[PDB]
Design a protein around this nucleic acid. Structure first.
Length: 209
DNA sequence: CATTCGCTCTGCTCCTTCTCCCATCCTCTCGATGGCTATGAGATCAACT
């Protein structure tokens, strides 16, 4: 029971570190490859005993390109997170001056909390993940090809090369599992590199909608 | 002043409802559809002078 919850927490942490590394936040190799017994050593083996508390699991990371661009990962203790908890995180983000955070929720989020993530979105970007959808890194699955988020300059070069408008690219939904993983917003473009049985390799581009 | 209570507002199911669609081309035969009589008033303007 605690042997199950500690395994879940470890897997979720591993996936979150992989996600942060793929978003380009500075993540050490040691924490990226931390084993289950090392997790038990650092945080504990009886989360029902409060060892760890899920408040202990919180992560803070900084971007490789700018040490002031920082992101939290929060693991709320309550199963169904309400607006009180979002307000607590908003306060903590305001005082630490952190604009991005991921909120990992065990069972869900209340309608009011969902709307509160929308209504603060320009200044503080809060994202919801279920813990279930973090128990496996979907980008390691064999059906999912390599996704690379493009820079604005690279999109301008793309559109200038093929002489096309953004609306002529094929789309990806902002709610797509992989778009959510990379955290890409409307109007960004993701380069996709996939093998092909007739050319050898093929690149395609999707505009987020 | 820490509840506590009551009241408004989503949003998640489970119906009922309703609207849409159902291979291509070609030949033949057969049935069915298949619509007053007549006398008056009376307005028009084509057309004679």
């Amino acid at each position: 029971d605690d042997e199950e919850e500690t395994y879940r927490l470890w897997k979720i942490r591993k996936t979150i570190m992989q996600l942060c590394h793929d978003r380009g936040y500075l993540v050490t190799q040691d924490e990226l490859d931390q084993t289950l017994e090392e997790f038990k050593a650092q945080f504990g083996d009886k989360p029902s005993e409060g060892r760890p508390r899920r408040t202990d699991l919180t992560v803070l990371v900084a971007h490789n390109d700018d040490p002031t661009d920082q992101m939290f990962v929060f693991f709320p203790e309550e199963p169904k997170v309400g607006i009180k908890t979002i307000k607590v995180y908003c306060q903590r983000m305001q005082e630490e001056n952190i604009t991005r955070a991921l909120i990992v929720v065990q069972q869900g989020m209340t309608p009011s909390a969902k709307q509160s993530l929308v209504d603060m979105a320009p200044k503080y970007i809060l994202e919801q993940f279920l813990q279930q959808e973090l128990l496996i890194n979907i980008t390691e699955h064999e059906l999912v090809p390599e996704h690379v988020v493009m820079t604005k300059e690279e999109v301008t070069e793309l559109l200038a090369r093929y002489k096309l408008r953004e609306n002529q690219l094929p789309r990806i939904q902002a709610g797509d599992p992989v778009a959510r993983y990379f955290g890409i917003k409307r109007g960004q473009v993701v380069k996709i590199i996939r093998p092909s049985e007739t050319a050898g390799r093929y690149i395609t581009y999707r505009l987020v909608q």
